[PDB]
Design a protein around this nucleic acid. Structure first.
Ligand code: MG
Ligand code: MG
Lengths: 749, 704, 250
RNA sequence: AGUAGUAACAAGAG
RNA sequence: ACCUCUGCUUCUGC
């Protein structure tokens, strides 16, 4: 007998064993080297689906820009970007007619949220492209670099503190003919030699700064499952993040009230919406009414939606609003229409006879001999060289960075909304759910040719607005089974446990957080993903083993030898009640099924030695690092599918709530002065929190400087503690003289 | 605006500029509120200054300062620090907080003072301030330019010289405002968001429209005035009929099988030996230093006596095969000569060849090597296709069988209190009895051990050639501990930066399998014959040659990180089996675990013989799903990811046919191309494609 | 006592770069430069933790640890080093330092911990005195429905809870936010009585108060009772094919 | 050589 | 060649 596990599907339905089709216990695919080839492939494909459009040289940037809007209608089933403006406006008008008052209330909520948003809302984000440094930075330091360069160049409306004044400064900074930024270079002199790095002030031109402001930084997507070949992703710079924020806020307020929208809800809420649409489309008008469901995918979704269509959508949704609000929401599709793509790190060249390797940049791709490259890269560079603008490739059509997820969901929901029986008046009608790229479509009719006519009507209407349904990846069957974002419906949603299997294991924060996260992950999968009780018990056991091996915190009576064995053994022998020791301290595992919702310090609190409990929960310990109330007990988990999520855990802060050390490669680069700047920033924020303790809880507001606020607080705290018996008169006079000396030092320099 | 900058003092100018910048307006534009706020701050500062509290509590109107102030200024500050001042004052005493921000606070009367400087009648503005600020002890003290005053309840706490200076300064400023010709507009003056485009962004906006529009505001006027009149139906009639989503009916009896590639046979690419491995065991180890891996390795190595002089019996064709022989001889010599807990090998030439030292090209700059005639970009060729060979099926056959040892040892659990915890304990013990003696559990233990030791050695000894023995620890059926040695791993240099950075190692693994019976399986290995041992069997006792499979292999940080976590294969297998149990338990309305695991009927199809489809029990299903997850972890690849994602749709279409749900596709040929694009050279993906073909043939025979 | 901080402020203003930063950064802009880093958020924390726990000194602790614990323990393991964490004043320490603190560090008083973390100890109090009934096997009809997951909240919105926390934890810095309701005054008086002389960090106290006083909701599949003390043990009571009869304590 | 797979590692920087 | 530094930091977005 040759063993075949797929023969298990001869007895079991495929949806009830679908976890045997997800090979998620191995490592996901990763890219090696650059993503320049994937980026150039994306630019070539995006211009190939729009090639019958109109080319125009941009007057402000010099970029060659392709316009496929209102172009020729598609002639075949190839992916096309020739979206028609009037069909988009008709679909948005139909969405406004079917949901009266939705657009006006979403616009009014967006208007109320614009006037309350501060600049620091842009600090919430991942790796943002920094036009100041021409690389990727975290979102807060990219925002700080942009604000600093803007203040040095005379743009300081953002000193009011609100987001819309920062956006006015962003738009006014495009008038500068010589924006001045600072670069870095090394200075090595001297009989022993020391070397440091000194700044150099460069001046961009108007075209240089405008190309940098419209730049997407491109890289390869790693650890993505379900694909053989890698794809490219893009992150935008700080000049467009604030406008994308308000556009996505409007589109989120729209998508929250559309029942055919799959965004922005979780897993259980999306399953409830899919169950509701399946219950509605199976109530049956007659008795012989047919119902078919397309398990659909969209081919080349981001490469075929156009920023000019999104501009028309934004201007049609906001119809009847104040014109400043229309312009402010229109900025982001305008800047995405004029976007350029940074082409990555370049390529590596290898000489086999001389045994050497070298790295050419993507800026060198415009002026290099083509004999270095293989035929695929040579064809890519020849196709790409007419789109080149100052180290970047012009990319007018398409949505490469893909930030208008909710707006693309609104566009798909409009096509879903077209198929009501009272609008179509046909022999067919449709309904379904739209979650950006993915879609489910239930088509009802009376005959099978009505089902085919409804499928063709939906497909051609999607082709008219730049939505390309994947014919290789979509299929249709009678309603009862479908799939939607790896959710498998077979007369009810089944469990897909293998999607959640990478989340099991040690999360990697610290000992306390990982214990809380591991037991919470087991509990959440018991509630949602139908994790059985025996498998939950084994998952507790496997988590405890992986936790003991990861943090070298094996049980105090065991015979392993790590770096932590002797110290944990000393803590074990000196402890009276061993059951009160945490697992991180070499103690036993307390967890079973009934107590996964209880944190480990509380679950062992009555069993602890009081001296060990006093040492472990000492608030005067150097290991814990409280920074902010809004970031307390938060981790960032990356699931097997989807973006990274913020996960809340329940943990008493102990000495196991430490922070791991930082990466230290910056010390060998030109950016090592960022460490000194960050250290000085942390010292200033620490002494401000000494003066204002609520700043860790509620963000303090004010247009006055930090030093003036601390001096005023010192003056009022001195006068309030003098008239209360807490502080003597000589200490009050010393405090007032020190504040006057600080004012004199401030007036001096 | 020059009068306000000339007559008033610059600290009053600074307070007024801070106030107007905090309120958004500008002194250069709205200058009436500028001069009004400047006069208000002037009157408030003349109220506040030169009033002190001594060391007894009496107001001594002095000009020099060691006496604390009598008043505290709350007007002119930022709003947040002003409310901080007010709240700290009210928490210092006991008074309830006012609703608005006053202007001063007197520490003598303990009272909040409010001052308004008007350009009209004193009584009307005072009655307005009284009717507005009613309900709290606020001492209103309205002044004006007439040199007069109005107070609350005719209680006047400000002294005579300060009020005389206030009235004199107000009259002087009124006369200087009236002689300068700027006085009537003060009595005349007694959601607005803007966002326009600057000209460069306006020209950017004009170039981001449909092509029939030249102006952005023309396009805005078109969009705001658009009315639909059958545009979609007109463009649907105008569109070609070759744009269509025609449904092709799906029937599994008429679809073809997957086309598996041609080429050479697929070769073994696992990081250790699987069905061909041979272990040297120590039963109940109790030697000195037991637990330390090199001590266990020497203790298991001493159990074997039949060593010879090693000869190459199967050559690695792309390698220098005498280097592998010298590597094994150096390793054995250094094991016999070691005195410690770890072993670092000398960096000999053959070991440097086997570990790839110096094989990276020297990193230079492009202008320093521009004129090299063979400076080419890196080879980015697709992988060479391989044929499906017979060995991976037999490997999977052996991986789902039972051994005589327990390989998994689970950590302790909390005590069962709930009845569902006792039910879960019985079901988990049934699964553990069906799964702990599986050979895939032994592969889990080998891979977790190897990847853990390799990651720790790669972090702690980046410049050393560390020897890592391959050690598992099992228990017999009688419960006795047993330590097994499978061979050795010599780590290379391991300066692992990126997660895909390779650490090269040398695997030296004991075996009894002759590699010449299946040579295409061993194209990466150089196999040495290292000895002879007596295998005792039922017929007789024979001297079998002991071989050593020597190989250069490589791993990365992410690959051995995922190899460290190979115990989640147990979770995948147990979750599937437990969902199958719970589906029957919901129907029978009782716990179905003991009927599932105890009734040993063959009722699950898990294989094929020449006699047809073979069935097995639920424990066979446990071991087979475990071995499938284990082989997914061992032979993890992008080919497997793409193959599983694309063949899941064909499986769901076959299920839709078997549910009589009338399945249909739109491009089945493109789906078959997307499946077959992912089947290149990986032996596990080839076996999974052959498995899909066998399942399709079984479905086509089950129908017809 | 607020005299040392102004000496530290004068010592910082004596430096030129700190004076330039403190005079150019507004109070509202300090939320931006507070999060200034070279260190990026980790995209693979599991692999990074498995790689770092093999290192000798992977933990960054406050520099005062060099006065708190010795440089070596009784076994000769180095506990801390003088090398600084990147962009910080923290030094690099060993996990043996954490174990040394847990077995031989300063013992503090922990009587405030069941009051601050009362939301966590209430779960254990409800589980310990809970009564288990028999398990019933049948088809469970679960309905994905929005319930609340906070057993023991007070009916306060985020603004009112923020006002109560600001009146309890940081009473001088509330601004123009008076306690409008009498229930908020009762919660404020009770919590200022309980959380008095509390040496637990005010970040943790404000966090636990915000987790307590705000009703939080989730979208869960429930088969039986939807009360928040039954949603708290939802993983224990219902399954796919089984129901566990359970009444919590109280 | 080997890992690997559309581009890299097989140490990098000073 | 000695010596120093680094191991996610020119490269992980919504
Ligand atoms: Mg889909
Ligand atoms: Mg290989």
């Amino acid at each position: 007998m040759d063993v075949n596990p797929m023969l298990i599907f001869l007895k079991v339905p495929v949806q009830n064993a679908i976890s045997t089709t997800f090979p998620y216990t191995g490592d996901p695919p990763y890219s090696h080297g650059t993503g320049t080839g994937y980026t150039m492939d994306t630019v070539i494909r995006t211009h190939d689906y729009s090639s019958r459009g109109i080319w125009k040289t941009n007057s402000e940037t010099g970029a060659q820009q392709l316009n496929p809007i209102d172009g020729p209608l598609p002639e075949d089933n190839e992916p096309s970007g020739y979206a028609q403006t009037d069909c988009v406006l008709e679909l948005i008008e139909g969405l406004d007619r079917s949901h009266p008052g939705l657009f006006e209330t979403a616009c009014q909520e967006t208007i109320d949220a614009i006037q309350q948003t501060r600049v620091d809302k842009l600090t919430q984000g991942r790796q943002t492209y920094d036009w100041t440094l021409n690389r990727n930075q975290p979102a807060a330091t990219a925002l700080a670099n942009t604000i600093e360069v803007f203040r040095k160049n005379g743009y300081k409306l953002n000193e009011s503190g609100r987001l819309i004044d920062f956006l006015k400064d962003v738009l006014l900074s495009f008038e500068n003919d010589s924006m001045e930024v600072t670069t870095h270079f090394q200075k090595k002199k001297r009989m022993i030699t020391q070397r440091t790095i000194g700044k150099k002030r460069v001046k961009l031109t108007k075209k240089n700064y405008l190309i940098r402001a419209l730049t997407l930084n491109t890289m390869t997507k790693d650890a993505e499952r379900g694909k053989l070949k890698r794809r490219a992703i893009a992150t935008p710079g700080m000049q467009i993040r604030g406008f994308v924020y308000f556009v996505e806020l409007l589109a989120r307020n729209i998508c929250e009230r559309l029942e055919q929208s799959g965004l922005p809800v979780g897993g259980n809420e999306k399953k409830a919406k899919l169950a509701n649409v399946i219950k509605k489309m199976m109530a049956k008008s007659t008795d012989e009414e047919l119902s078919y469901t397309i398990t659909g995918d969209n081919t080349k979704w981001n490469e075929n939606q156009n920023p000019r269509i999104f501009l028309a959508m934004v201007l049609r949704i906001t119809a009847g609003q104040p014109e400043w609000f229309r312009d402010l929401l229109a900025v982001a599709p305008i800047m995405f229409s004029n976007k350029v793509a940074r082409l990555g790190r370049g390529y590596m060249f290898e000489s086999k006879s001389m045994h050497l390797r070298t790295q050419i940049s993507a800026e060198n791709l415009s002026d290099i001999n083509l004999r270095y490259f293989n035929e695929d890269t040579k064809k890519k560079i020849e196709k790409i060289r007419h789109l080149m603008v100052e180290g970047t490739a012009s990319l007018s059509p398409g949505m490469m960075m893909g930030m208008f997820n909710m707006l693309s969901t609104v566009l798909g929901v409009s096509v879903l909304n077209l198929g009501q029986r009272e609008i179509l008046k046909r022999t067919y009608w449709w309904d379904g759910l739209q979650s950006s790229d993915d879609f489910a479509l239930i088509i009802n009719g009376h005959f099978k040719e009505d089902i085919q006519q409804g499928v063709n009507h939906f497909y051609r209407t999607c082709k008219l607005v730049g939505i390309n349904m994947s014919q290789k990846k979509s299929y249709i069957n009678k309603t009862g089974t479908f799939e939607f974002t790896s959710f498998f419906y077979r007369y009810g949603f089944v469990a897909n446990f293998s999607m959640e299997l990478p989340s099991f294991g040690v999360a990697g924060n610290n000992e306390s957080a990982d214990m809380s996260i591991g037991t919470t992950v087991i509990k959440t999968n018991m509630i949602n993903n139908d994790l059985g009780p025996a498998t939950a018990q084994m998952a507790i056991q496997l988590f405890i083993k992986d936790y003991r091996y990861t943090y070298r915190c094996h049980r105090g009576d065991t015979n392993l030898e790590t770096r932590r064995t002797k110290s944990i053994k000393r803590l074990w022998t000196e402890t009276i009640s061993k059951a009160g020791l945490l697992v991180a301290d070499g103690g036993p595992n307390p967890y079973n099924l009934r107590n996964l919702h209880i944190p480990e310090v509380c679950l062992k609190w009555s069993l602890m030695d009081p001296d060990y409990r006093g040492r472990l929960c000492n608030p005067n310990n150097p290991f814990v690092h409280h920074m902010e109330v809004e970031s307390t007990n938060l981790a960032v988990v990356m699931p097997a599918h989807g973006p990274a999520k913020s996960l809340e855990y329940d943990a008493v802060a102990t000495t196991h709530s430490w922070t791991p050390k930082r990466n230290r490669s910056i010390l060998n680069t030109n950016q090592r002065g960022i460490l000194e700047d960050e250290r000085i920033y942390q010292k200033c924020c620490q002494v401000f929190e000494k003066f204002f303790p609520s700043s860790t809880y509620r963000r303090p507001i004010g247009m006055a400087s930090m030093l003036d606020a601390m001096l005023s607080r010192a003056r009022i705290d001195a006068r309030i503690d003098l008239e209360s018996g807490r502080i003597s008169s000589q200490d009050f006079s010393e405090i007032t003289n020190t504040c006057k000396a600080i004012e004199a030092l401030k007036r001096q320099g | 605006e020059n009068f306000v900058r000339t007559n008033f003092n610059p600290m009053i100018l600074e307070r007024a500029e801070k106030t107007m910048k905090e309120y958004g307006e500008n002194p250069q534009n709205e200058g009436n509120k500028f001069a009004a706020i400047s006069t208000h701050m002037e009157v408030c500062f003349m109220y506040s200054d030169f009033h002190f509290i001594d060391l007894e509590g009496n107001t001594i109107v002095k000009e020099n300062d060691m006496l604390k102030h009598r008043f505290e200024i709350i007007e002119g500050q930022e709003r947040n620090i002003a409310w901080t001042i007010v709240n700290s004052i009210c928490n210092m005493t006991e008074n309830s907080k006012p609703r608005f921000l006053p202007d001063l606070y007197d520490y003598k009367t303990n009272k909040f003072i409010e001052i308004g400087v008007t350009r009209r009648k004193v009584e009307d503005y005072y009655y307005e301030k009284a009717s507005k600020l009613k309900g709290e002890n606020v001492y209103i003290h309205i002044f004006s330019f007439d040199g007069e005053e109005m107070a609350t309840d005719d209680e006047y706490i400000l002294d005579e010289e300060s009020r005389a200076r206030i009235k004199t300064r107000l009259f002087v400023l009124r006369q200087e405002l009236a002689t300068a010709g700027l006085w009537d507009s003060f009595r005349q003056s007694e959601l607005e968001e803007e966002f326009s485009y600057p000209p460069t962004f306006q020209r950017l906006a004009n170039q981001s429209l449909p092509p029939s529009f030249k102006d952005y505001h023309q396009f805005k006027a078109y969009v705001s005035s658009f009315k639909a009149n059958g545009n979609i139906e007109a463009k649907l009639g105008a569109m070609s009929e070759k744009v269509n989503a025609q449904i092709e009916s799906f029937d599994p009896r008429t679809i073809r099988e997957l086309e598996l590639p041609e080429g050479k046979f697929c070769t073994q690419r696992s990081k250790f030996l699987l069905m061909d491995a041979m272990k040297l065991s120590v039963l109940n180890p109790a030697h000195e230093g037991e637990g330390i891996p090199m001590k266990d390795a020497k203790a298991c190595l001493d159990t074997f006596w039949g060593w010879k002089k090693a000869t190459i019996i199967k050559k690695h064709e792309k390698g220098v095969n005498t280097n592998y022989l010298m590597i094994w001889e150096q390793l054995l010599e250094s094991i016999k000569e070691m005195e410690g807990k770890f072993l670092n090998l000398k960096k000999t030439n053959h070991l440097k060849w086997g570990l790839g030292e110096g094989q990276a090209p020297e990193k230079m700059d492009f202008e320093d090597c521009k004129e090299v005639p063979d400076l080419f970009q890196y080879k980015s060729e697709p992988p060479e296709k391989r044929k499906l060979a017979s060995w991976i099926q037999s490997e999977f056959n052996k991986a789902s069988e039972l051994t005589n040892s327990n390989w998994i040892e689970f950590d302790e659990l909390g005590n069962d209190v709930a009845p569902i915890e006792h039910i879960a304990s019985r079901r988990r013990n049934f699964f553990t009895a069906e799964v702990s003696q599986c050979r895939a559990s032994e592969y889990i233990m080998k891979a977790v051990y190897i990847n853990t030791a390799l990651l720790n050695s790669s972090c702690t000894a980046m410049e050393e050639y560390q020897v890592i023995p391959i050690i598992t620890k099992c228990r017999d059926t009688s419960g006795q501990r047993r330590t097994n040695l499978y061979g050795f791993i010599i780590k290379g240099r391991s300066h692992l930066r990126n997660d895909t950075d390779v650490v090269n190692f040398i695997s030296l693994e004991f075996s009894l399998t002759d590699p010449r019976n299946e040579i295409h399986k061993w194209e990466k290995y150089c196999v040495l014959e290292i000895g002879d041992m007596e295998i005792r069997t039922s017929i007789s006792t024979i001297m079998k040659p002991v071989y050593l499979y020597v190989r250069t292999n490589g791993t990365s940080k992410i690959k051995m990180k995922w190899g460290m976590e190979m115990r989640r294969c147990l979770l995948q297998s147990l979750q599937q089996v437990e969902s199958m149990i719970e589906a029957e338990s919901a129907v029978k309305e009782k716990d179905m675990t003991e009927p599932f695991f105890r009734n040993r009927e063959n009722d699950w199809p898990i294989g094929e013989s020449p006699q047809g489809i073979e069935k097995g029990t639920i424990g066979k299903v446990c071991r087979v799903l475990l071995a499938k997850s284990v082989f997914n972890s061992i032979y993890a690849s992008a080919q497997l990811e793409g193959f599983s994602a694309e063949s899941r749709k064909l499986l769901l279409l076959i299920q839709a046919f078997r549910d009589n749900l009338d399945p249909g596709t739109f491009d089945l040929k493109g789906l078959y191309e997307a499946i077959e694009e992912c089947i290149i050279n990986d032996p596990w993906v080839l076996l999974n494609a052959s498995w899909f073909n066998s399942f399709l043939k079984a479905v086509q025979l089950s129908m017809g | 006592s607020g005299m040392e901080r102004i000496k530290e402020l004068m010592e910082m203003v004596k430096n030129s770069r700190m004076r330039e930063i403190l005079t150019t950064t507004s109070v509202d802009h300090m939320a931006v430069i507070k999060k200034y880093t070279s260190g990026r958020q980790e995209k693979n924390p599991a692999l990074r933790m498995k790689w770092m726990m093999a290192m000798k000194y992977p933990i960054s602790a406050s520099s005062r640890i060099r006065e708190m614990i010795p440089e070596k323990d009784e076994d000769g393991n180095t506990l801390w080093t003088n090398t600084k964490d990147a962009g910080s004043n923290r030094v690099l320490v060993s996990p043996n330092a954490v174990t040394w603190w847990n077995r031989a560090g300063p013992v503090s008083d922990v009587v405030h911990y069941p009051r601050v973390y009362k939301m966590y100890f209430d779960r254990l109090e409800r589980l310990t005195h809970g009564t288990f009934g028999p398990v019933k096997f049948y088809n469970q009809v679960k309905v994905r429905k929005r319930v609340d997951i906070n057993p023991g909240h007070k009916d306060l919105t985020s603004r009112e809870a923020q006002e109560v926390i600001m009146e309890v934890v940081f009473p001088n810095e509330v601004g123009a936010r008076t306690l409008s309701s009498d229930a908020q005054l009762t919660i404020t008086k009770e919590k200022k009585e309980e959380l008095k002389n509390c040496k637990i960090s005010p970040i943790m106290v404000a966090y636990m108060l915000e987790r307590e006083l705000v009703r939080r909701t989730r979208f869960l599949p429930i088969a039986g009772a939807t009360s928040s003390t039954y949603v708290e043990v939802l993983h224990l009571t219902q399954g796919t094919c089984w129901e566990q009869q359970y009444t919590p304590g109280g």
